[PDB]
Design a protein around this ligand. Structure first.
Ligand code: HEM
Ligand code: HEM
Ligand SMILES: N=C(NCCC[C@H](N)C(=O)O)N[N+](=O)[O-]
Ligand SMILES: N=C(NCCC[C@H](N)C(=O)O)N[N+](=O)[O-]
Ligand SMILES: [Zn+2]
Lengths: 414, 416
């Protein structure tokens, strides 16, 4: 029933009762655990050519509406009762319904709060929500996106934000941002399969070129955006350079580091995930906050399938790359992460290190235990890619489950 | 696609399907509603003491499954010998309520148990285990002799060899053979007046139990604990391991000359001794096993965990780092040097050890071998990925499926 949750560093115990509120199934079963899998095999967000089962939708809507009125301490009030009737009325006559801006703001904050893989949830209550449901063209999407970036960047003093475009509708195409993030570096396939730039963005870089983009030939060329309005081909838009803040990477004491010519953008803005609230689905809702240093210094720059700069830094450090036992990889990774933190701090751009971030998450777990009786969390994504057990979250048991409102993965539009 | 879990490796972009999980005969802690994969001790396998003899119907099915596994491994499934063995087991259980394994069945079962352990990253060595049969043991004193022989053979003066010693299985309404200590070699943990602990905080309870049973405690930070061995229906007996048999390694650093002055050290032989080995329904409550250490076990967990020796701050201070702010990455830097020291020192003393890079690379080979041999490999991601430099190793980028296969090693309640 209710799982016992233990923290092995402190010996403390809690019981997660919130998990009983989950209504959506994960990938695990008593026979085998699939918790380490990145994407679902079925829990996707299948096509929307037909109207979602009124019965199903209506139960999800009532539940969300109930959540909303409880949040404003007006449960069972007159407004609550009437809002429910409104929702009932709209679904029965049209097969769908619409949220009020206040409910949308509450829903977006709750989705972030419920995101099991996010370690920055202590900030969940501070989110600027831009209502972009009044959008009817790719060109208008571009304007909203540019305004999101300017606001979020704030000259280095990053502010969390999300822009919500029109919801999905039966039998009609979705509004979609093809890019995986608003700002990404190009990846050009060259010679013998090798790649100049970010290997993770090969497919999108090619699609952009296919749609008329004049490619560059550098390692850090910011990609243009491919925005798509319902049932229309995606359109190409180049982001004004002055809008895209970047940070030149240098090291506090290693004079030669800057000579590597490395850099990274200041704004992390996932733009290909789906936001679900009360049964309604928002296929284009880019969100952003600020980077945790390991995302850049460890994963983006050191992953074998990414920039893979470990060996270069090791050679410049004149380390012994002859054997694993010298821990040259470990030493290089630490300096690279140090350079990232040093550079962002020098450029006066917001960023948080993995120690500070995990400490804040533990506080978040405590806050949620008192407030809701639990907190859905995915251990493999919460524990940092380097120095895992050196952080507090490593020693904390976690229960993972799906709560709604939620952010979910969805098929690539092409 | 295939009606089995699809598993992806994000570094290579390759895919595999796990069909071996279909063989699982025991449920884990997860459900479609929520994942409990991160729990260290979810009340599942937990071999809680089940005194009164087990349901002849349950044991029989488990026994039949194991016998089928054994005959399959030697390619004689369905043979006359196979059907005769099945008859023998069913008859023995019918008259006595339990049954016994043949020598070769025990050897096969013990290796399979290791092969099946989801939390072990050193499984590429599973086929080379030395299995010591101690099922004739009849006293606590004899358990000590068997244990000392295990330590001598396994240690082999620095060139470690994997081994396991199996004592008598649990019997109908009779006391179990039990080793009270968590490992054959462990450092004492002494509770101080101010509330702190000198030594290893993880062993405070066992240390106090040893004292309660007549052990005269020391006062060091690295005192090797004595063994509390228990024979059927008897109070446990205390035995001190001869120092010459317990090989230890003083820690020093390759370039930081002052590290040696810290007086740190660790023992060479990791030997978990409180787990239960289950084979075909039969339960071996005392069956210690050992191989060799992966460097992060010592350098990262044992030495740097907050609830263990917790030496991070001391080393950072020696390196003159800024321990006042997280962004200086003082914890990360100290940890790296501590791990290098462990590797350097074991190499210097010629004691077998494997770094986390070499170990994870070998585990990837094991996964590839097992994909072909059994169609999958149960693995606990959180335990397989190392505690430092996680994504710098290949296993981090490999998805994994976790499930319970038998034979298996399971946790069991403390005897006290
Ligand atoms: C304020 C600073 C924030 C920090 C430091 C932060 C940090 C992180 C980290 C480290 C991850 C995992 C990244 C990876 O391994 O790819 C993550 C994932 C995630 N975060 Fe946060 N986050 C923040 C703000 C936000 C905001 C504003 C939202 C949404 C409104 C959000 C939603 C999520 C979601 C949905 C994921 C999972 C993405 C995926 O599945 O790939 N985060 N976050
Ligand atoms: C040959 C070298 C070996 C290496 C390098 C190795 C390494 C490891 C590591 C790193 C762990 C996790 C440690 C922890 O986080 O507490 C582990 C766990 C485990 N290993 Fe291996 N192992 C080896 C040999 C063995 C042998 C010989 C057996 C048994 C025949 C074995 C059975 C297990 C089991 C059952 C666990 C889980 C224990 C628990 O749940 O606490 N290992 N091993
Ligand atoms: N910090 C955030 N990260 C989302 C994923 C970014 C990705 N790891 C990368 O580009 O490295 N989100 N946020 O703050 O909104
Ligand atoms: N390597 C092994 N590890 C098992 C657990 C040992 C524990 N982490 C510690 O003492 O640090 N076993 N083995 O080799 O048999
Ligand atoms: Zn699970």
């Amino acid at each position: 029933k209710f799982p016992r949750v233990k923290n092995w560093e402190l010996g403390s115990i809690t019981y997660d009762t919130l998990c009983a509120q989950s209504q959506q199934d994960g990938p695990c079963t008593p026979r085998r655990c699939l918790g380490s899998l990145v994407l679902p095999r079925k829990l996707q967000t299948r096509p929307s050519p037909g109207p979602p089962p009124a019965e199903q939708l209506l139960s999800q809507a009532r539940d969300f509406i109930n959540q909303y009125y409880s949040s404003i301490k007006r449960s069972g009030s007159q407004a609550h009762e009437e809002r429910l009737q409104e929702v009932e009325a709209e679904v029965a006559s049209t097969g769908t319904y619409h949220l009020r801006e206040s409910e949308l703001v509450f829903g977006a904050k709750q989705a972030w709060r419920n995101a099991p893989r996010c370690v920055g949830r202590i900030q969940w209550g501070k989110l600027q929500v831009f209502d972009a449901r009044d959008c009817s063209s790719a060109q208008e999407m571009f304007t909203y996106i540019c305004n999101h970036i300017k606001y979020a960047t704030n000259r280095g003093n990053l502010r969390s934000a999300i822009t919500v475009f029109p919801q999905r509708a039966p039998g009609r195409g979705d509004f979609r941002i093809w890019n995986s993030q608003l700002v990404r570096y190009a990846g050009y396939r060259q010679q013998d399969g090798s790649v100049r730039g970010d290997p993770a963005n090969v497919e999108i870089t090619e699609l952009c070129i296919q749609h008329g983009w004049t490619p560059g030939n550098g390692r850090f060329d910011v990609l243009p955006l491919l925005l798509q309005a319902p049932d229309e081909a995606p359109e190409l838009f180049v982001l004004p350079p002055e809008l895209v803040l970047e940070v030149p990477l240098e090291h506090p004491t290693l004079e030669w580091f800057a000579a590597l010519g490395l850099r990274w953008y200041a704004l992390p803005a996932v733009s290909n995930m789906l936001l679900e609230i009360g049964g309604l689905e928002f296929s284009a809702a880019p969100f952003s906050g600020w980077y945790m240093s390991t995302e850049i210094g460890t994963r983006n720059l050191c992953d074998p399938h990414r920039y893979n700069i470990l060996e270069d830094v090791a050679v410049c450090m004149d380390l012994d790359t002859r054997t694993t036992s010298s821990l040259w990889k470990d030493k290089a990774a630490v300096e690279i992460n140090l350079a990232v933190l040093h550079s962002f701090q020098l450029a006066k751009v917001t960023i948080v290190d993995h120690h500070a971030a995990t400490v804040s998450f533990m506080k978040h777990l405590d806050n949620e235990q008192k407030a809701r009786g639990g907190c859905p969390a995915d251990w493999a994504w919460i524990v940092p890619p380097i120095s895992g057990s050196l952080t507090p979250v490593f020693h904390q048991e976690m229960v993972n489950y799906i709560l709604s409102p939620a952010f979910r993965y969805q098929p690539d539009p092409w």
